[PDB]
Design a protein around this ligand. Structure first.
Ligand code: FE2
Ligand code: FE2
Lengths: 221, 222
């Protein structure tokens, strides 16, 4: 049940279709698409219009995990659903009413992801864990780096894995061949990796490595 | 001095490089790139990371007019300059200190555009007209998709052209072959058009039509 989802912010964004296609051909399990509105985080990447074009090119099969680093996640639920997103991963910090938003995401036919930034206690996420499809533990601060993987996020992953053995747990931020062992041993089964994959001359090899480390750790649990 | 700048939001945004190459190969004079942050307008398009990749793909020559429909235009000046934007067109409504922002744009080596939404008096542009490279008169409300061209914006264009004969004036919003003459007769010399160019089998012909309607109307007034 371990899956690798390349992030594409490090890719040639003027040729996004080609970059996604070669990730899929390289054996990516899903694509992790970072949506930043310049308010929740200090960068603007792309929104649903790009997602819609991507979906049109890639067809119906590929799974899009939308990482919604936006200040008003309620606003983009329907646009992302219409664009063809599979999963809407919103930040717990970005809404006063996560329960209502979770309901809305499901009513719009999408899976539910719930993300926490490094400074947010995993204790805030736990109360909602049985309502979501996937928890995302950030391992860098979103919108800034360009940062080193934060090893002190691993206790969050471990706690979640301990308390919720069946929960899919994703990590995102500086994850690569060098740090995937930490994530996998802590309990993560969904791995987002950007530069490590996208800049590789052999992304299939990198993806296989990442998945194999996770799988090995899962079989040990 | 009449120029056509396709807007690219109705293009295949998964292949922005190819779509822009096609526009340039069709004789587009520049590219008009709509940046929306989901706050100043109720849509999110793309930001400087996309611009940086587009500049890399297209090379140094093409001109990018960045239509910054963003709440904090001060924030994206350096990122856009680093990304290789030629002109940073911000909304007058979006800053309380346009003078400082204009200065910051020039200090970062970019040309300065100043945009006004339909509800904003063209008079607000006047104090700044001597400091900017281009005025952008919106002819639809930005961020609400396909809207009808607002002919009642033409007096804004005509007023600007009358007050500032040497000022480049861009129109943007529902502009196509059906409405370009209205813009040109009012004084606009920079025309943004989207679907009418992007959807065509022969975008060169559409671009040429827009440009020549504009040029011949401009020649007439002269
Ligand atoms: Fe992400
Ligand atoms: Fe525009």
């Amino acid at each position: 049940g371990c899956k690798i989802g390349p992030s594409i912010l490090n890719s040639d964004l003027a040729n996004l279709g080609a970059e996604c296609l070669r990730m899929l051909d390289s054996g990516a399990d899903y694509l992790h698409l970072d949506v930043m509105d310049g308010h929740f985080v200090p960068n603007i990447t792309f929104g649903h219009p790009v997602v819609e074009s991507l979906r049109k090119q890639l067809g119906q099969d590929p799974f899009f995990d939308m990482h919604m680093m936006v200040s008003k996640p309620e606003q983009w639920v329907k646009p992302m659903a219409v664009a063809g997103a599979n999963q809407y991963t919103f930040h717990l910090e970005a809404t006063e009413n996560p329960g209502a938003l979770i309901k809305d995401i499901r009513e719009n036919g999408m899976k539910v992801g719930l993300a926490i930034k490094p400074g947010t206690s995993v204790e805030y996420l736990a109360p909602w864990a049985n309502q979501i499809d996937m928890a995302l533990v950030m391992t860098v601060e979103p919108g800034f780096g360009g940062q080193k993987f934060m090893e002190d996020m691993m206790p969050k992953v471990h706690w979640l894995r301990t308390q919720f053995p069946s929960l899919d747990i994703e990590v995102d931020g500086g994850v690569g061949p060098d740090t995937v062992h930490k994530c996998a041993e802590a309990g993560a089964n969904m791995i987002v990796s950007g530069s490590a994959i996208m800049r590789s001359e052999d992304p299939r090899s990198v993806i296989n490595l990442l998945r194999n480390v996770c799988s090995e750790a899962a079989q040990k649990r």
